[PDB]
UniProtKB/Swiss-Prot annotation:
The C-terminal half (89-105) of the Ser/Pro-rich region and the transmembrane domain are necessary and sufficient for membrane integration. Changing residue 33 to A: No effect on stimulation of HSP93 ATP hydrolysis. Inserts into the inner envelope membrane from the stroma after import from the cytoplasm. The transit peptide undergoes a two-step processing. The initial cleavage to generate the intermediate found in the stroma is mediated by the stromal processing peptidase (SPP) while the final processing step by a signal peptidase I-type (SPase I), possibly PLSP1, requires association with the inner membrane. Expressed in seedlings, flowers, leaves, stems and roots. It is found in: Plastid, Chloroplast inner membrane. This is Protein TIC 40, chloroplastic. Disruption phenotype: Small and chlorotic, but not seedling lethal. Defective in chloroplast protein import. Part of the Tic complex. Interacts with HSP93, TIC110 and LTD. Involved in protein precursor import into chloroplasts. Part of the motor complex consisting of a co-chaperone (TIC40) and a chaperone (HSP93) associated with the import channel (TIC110). Causes the release of bound transit peptides from TIC110 and stimulates ATP hydrolysis by HSP93. Involved in reinsertion of proteins from the chloroplast stroma into the inner membrane.
């Protein structure tokens, strides 16, 4: 996934957050389906990240 990881370097905030377990778990779990966020909803950390990812990537370029 070096392709997408390269674009994350755009916001050092997500690249730094990418170094968090709840985030890597949110993305690894995202594989199941966007319904995974309904689980990290309590993880305020994943919220700021998943809310940033969608606020800046709403149409999802990838």
């Amino acid at each position: 996934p070096e392709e997408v990881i390269s674009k994350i370097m755009e916001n050092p905030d997500v690249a730094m957050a990418f170094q968090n377990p709840r985030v890597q778990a949110a993305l690894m779990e995202c594989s199941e389906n966007p319904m995974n966020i309904m689980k990290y909803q309590n993880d305020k950390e994943v919220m700021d990240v998943f809310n940033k990812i969608s606020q800046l990537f709403p149409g999802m370029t990838g």
